[PDB]
């Protein structure tokens, strides 16, 4: 308590000086539920950090962490963070390619992954290990560190989330974002928080905080469920789940199949929050119906910021409304919308680039100072500082009340499966293929790539599936290949 909490991990256990039986996160033994208490993960965090702790490892030193969302996961991020050691999260149904390339850019001391995880192939180079409730165990010891780092500081980096591009986020960015949302008070110390996002992403941590910062319980929801709609709303409701939170895709099976069961949870859920992807109305009046006592909020922003507001879908959603609010960013931010000049934008309804100012932006990206300079940019609004504001590429603008609508986007960045891809290097690398002079992709939901053949070439339609997949990952493939004479 007279310790002042500046670090991750110091954030994530406050509930265990302050309600330590409580049940942290909900887990599995075997085939018997059990919930592991704050207490509980407090120790395995520091069983956990006892076992990296003496193999030689200097704080900046990187540790990948392969698993789904699980209180093991957070006990070893958990336990990472009280050592310094940024964490790449990475999710088990993870290509080898991509893989090894994150290994390879980031090159980590140390691999480790869950107690039944069947991955194999790394360097030499990198440590190996794994963890489970039973324990952390080293397999291949890591290559010591300089031994010459010393303390953690608030703007070291606490995490690494790969896109290959990795954001670099500080202690200090991710306990801002987690004060800014806690304000909201979406949640309380007797929520079952349900999470659904792959551990890979950004939004797990999120997932994380909410609860873990709020004295809740973490529900890790196991991915397999997801394409089983009916499965996936039983294991709500024995998990029994109060708030449920992910991309709205999680709801779409249940809406359209199964929503007199889901509707049997209505009196048990009372939030769900979504983010990544707009939510379809149709689907939200839907889910609304079934949920009637559900608080369903809408977090926009971004990795780069974890996210930026959450915005209260109004309930019931006026008929004519087009599309849902995303709010002004949370106590302490402020995404301010300039010109093409960036010269502000103080007309309403007026559509503006969001320009993000917090206590939560991300360090820089991995490697790649020229893409941190572009997107950290000098603030426009008053550049005599020294500082800088982040230039997210989404549009908005803005109501007489202060409200933002999300507009889209100032490129040609797409979300598919929730990963950002952006058109302009799918289609980069089709026209490298020889025999195409141009090429045109487009979103429909469905990949399409439109190419316009170089003159006298043949064109074969699988060889240019398989040539993109040479270096384009698997949500970045095409499914749907037209050839035309020219292009509008
Ligand atoms: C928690 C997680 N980090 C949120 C996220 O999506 O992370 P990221 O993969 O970095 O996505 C960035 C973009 O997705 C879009 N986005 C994001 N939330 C919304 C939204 N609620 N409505 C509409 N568009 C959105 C915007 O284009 C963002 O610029
Ligand atoms: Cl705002």
């Known amino acids: ?10 954030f994530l256990l406050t509930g265990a000086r302050l309600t330590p039986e409580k049940p942290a996160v909900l887990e599995l033994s075997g085939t018997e539920p059990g919930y592991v208490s704050y207490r509980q993960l407090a120790n395995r965090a520091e069983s956990y950090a006892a076992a990296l702790g003496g193999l030689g490892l200097d704080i900046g030193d990187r540790v990948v962490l392969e698993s789904d969302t699980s209180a093991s996961a957070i006990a070893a991020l958990l336990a990472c963070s009280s050592l310094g050691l940024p964490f790449v999260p990475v999710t088990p149904e993870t290509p080898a390619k991509r893989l090894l390339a994150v290994v390879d850019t980031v090159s980590p001391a140390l691999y480790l992954q869950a107690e039944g995880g069947r991955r194999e192939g790394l360097p030499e180079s990198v440590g190996t290990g794994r963890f489970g409730p039973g324990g952390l165990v080293i397999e291949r010891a890591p290559r010591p560190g300089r031994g010459f780092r010393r303390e953690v500081a608030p703007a070291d980096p606490a995490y690494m989330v790969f896109t290959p591009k990795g954001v670099v986020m500080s202690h200090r960015a991710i306990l801002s974002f987690y004060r800014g ?118 977090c926009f922003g971004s990795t780069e910021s974890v996210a930026a507001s959450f915005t209260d ?102 979300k598919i499966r929730g990963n950002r891809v952006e058109l302009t290097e799918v289609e980069r690398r089709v026209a490298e293929f020889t025999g195409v002079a141009a090429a045109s992709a487009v979103l429909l939901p469905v990949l399409a790539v439109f190419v316009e053949l170089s003159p006298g070439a043949e064109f074969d339609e699988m060889e240019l599936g398989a040539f993109c997949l040479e270096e384009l990952p698997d949500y970045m493939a095409p499914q749907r290949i037209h050839v035309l004479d020219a292009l509008p």
């Open 1 to 10: 308590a007279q310790n002042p909490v500046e670090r991750l991990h110091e």
């Open 181 to 298: 949302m806690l304000s909201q008070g979406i949640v309380g110390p007797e929520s079952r928080v349900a999470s659904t996002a792959p551990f890979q992403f950004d939004f797990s941590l999120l997932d994380i905080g909410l609860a873990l910062g709020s004295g809740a319980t973490v529900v890790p929801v196991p991915r397999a469920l997801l394409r089983w709609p009916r499965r996936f709303v039983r294991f709500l409701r024995d998990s029994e789940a109060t708030q449920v939170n992910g991309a709205p895709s999680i709801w779409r099976g249940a809406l359209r199949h199964e929503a007199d069961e889901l509707a049997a949870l209505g009196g048990r859920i009372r939030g769900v929050l979504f983010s990544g992807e707009p939510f379809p109305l149709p689907e939200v009046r839907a889910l609304q119906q079934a949920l009637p006592l559900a608080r369903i909020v809408n």
């Open 313 to 414: 879908v109004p309930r019931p959603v006026p008929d004519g409304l087009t599309k849902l609010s995303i709010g002004h960013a949370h106590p302490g931010a402020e995404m301010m919308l300039l010109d093409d000049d960036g010269v502000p934008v103080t007309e309403p309804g007026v559509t503006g680039h969001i320009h993000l100012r917090s206590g939560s932006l991300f360090t820089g990206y991995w490697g790649d100072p020229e893409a941190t300079a572009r997107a950290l940019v000098p603030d426009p609004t008053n550049p005599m500082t020294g500082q800088t504001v982040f230039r997210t590429g989404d549009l908005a603008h803005r109501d007489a009340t202060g409200e933002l609508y999300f507009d889209g986007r100032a490129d040609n960045q797409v």
